């Protein structure tokens, strides 16, 4: 079954596609009925990484302001996080510093974070360039992938890469 157990967070602005990413990862389908996360969703999945089985306990947090206290209470103990923005929404990208600060403060400075530029399937609507996001990631010691919960592009890869880095520096 599993050799390791990593607690993962999915964090970022409301509407960035956090729940859809979790649903894509586990159910390999784009979630049809989606609505603002009404607190914090849970998912569990075991992956083969670094020659080992790693069970991920994933807490998909709410981005909405009224759930800030509730979502923040999930941070402690998290070994990894997918920090998500929407590539079509500059405001979601602008909010990354506050998400990142709070995550590293409330979980260890050790938390391994992969930046996810989600909804990359909506490239016509792009408001954040890959290169500027890569720069932000480089500067803040983040892994970085652009993802699509809709097509599944880079979704499994985001979770796998996060786990991989926890295991091997």
């Amino acid at each position: 079954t599993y050799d390791f157990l990593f607690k993962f967070l999915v964090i970022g602005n409301a509407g960035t596609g956090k729940s859809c990413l979790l649903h894509q990862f586990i159910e390999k389908k784009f979630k049809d009925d989606s609505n603002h996360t009404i607190g914090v969703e849970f998912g569990s999945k075991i992956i083969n990484v670094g020659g080992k089985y790693v069970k991920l306990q994933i807490w998909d947090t709410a981005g909405l302001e009224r759930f800030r206290s509730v979502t923040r209470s999930y941070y402690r103990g998290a070994a990894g996080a997918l920090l998500v923005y929407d590539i079509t929404s500059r405001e979601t990208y602008n909010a990354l510093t506050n998400w990142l600060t709070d995550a590293r403060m409330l979980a260890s400075q050790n938390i391994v974070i992969i930046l996810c530029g989600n909804k990359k399937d909506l490239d016509a609507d792009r408001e954040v360039t890959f290169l500027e996001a890569s720069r932000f990631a480089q500067e803040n010691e983040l892994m970085f992938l652009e993802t699509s919960a809709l097509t599944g592009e880079d979704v499994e890869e985001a979770f796998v890469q996060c786990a991989r880095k926890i295991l091997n520096k």
Binding site: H23, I38, G39, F42, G43, S44, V70, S73
Partner: protein, 61 residues
């Protein structure tokens, strides 16, 4: 082959209290984990529920 419980399916509106809302969520996930015989997840979620209820009580002071 992972597991992902339905978000307190097709039910009431969002609770006026965000923590009580989260408690409803976990309670629903526990019911589904129990029903699926996933004792690891039952234990994980029950531990989370325990922490949420403690935090709720403390807020009432």
């Amino acid at each position: 082959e992972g597991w992902l419980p339905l978000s307190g399916g097709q039910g009431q509106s969002e609770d006026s209290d965000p923590l009580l809302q989260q408690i409803h969520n976990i309670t629903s996930f526990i019911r589904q984990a129990k029903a699926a015989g996933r004792m690891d997840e039952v234990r994980t979620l029950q531990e989370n529920l325990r922490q949420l209820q403690d935090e709720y009580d403390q807020q009432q002071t």
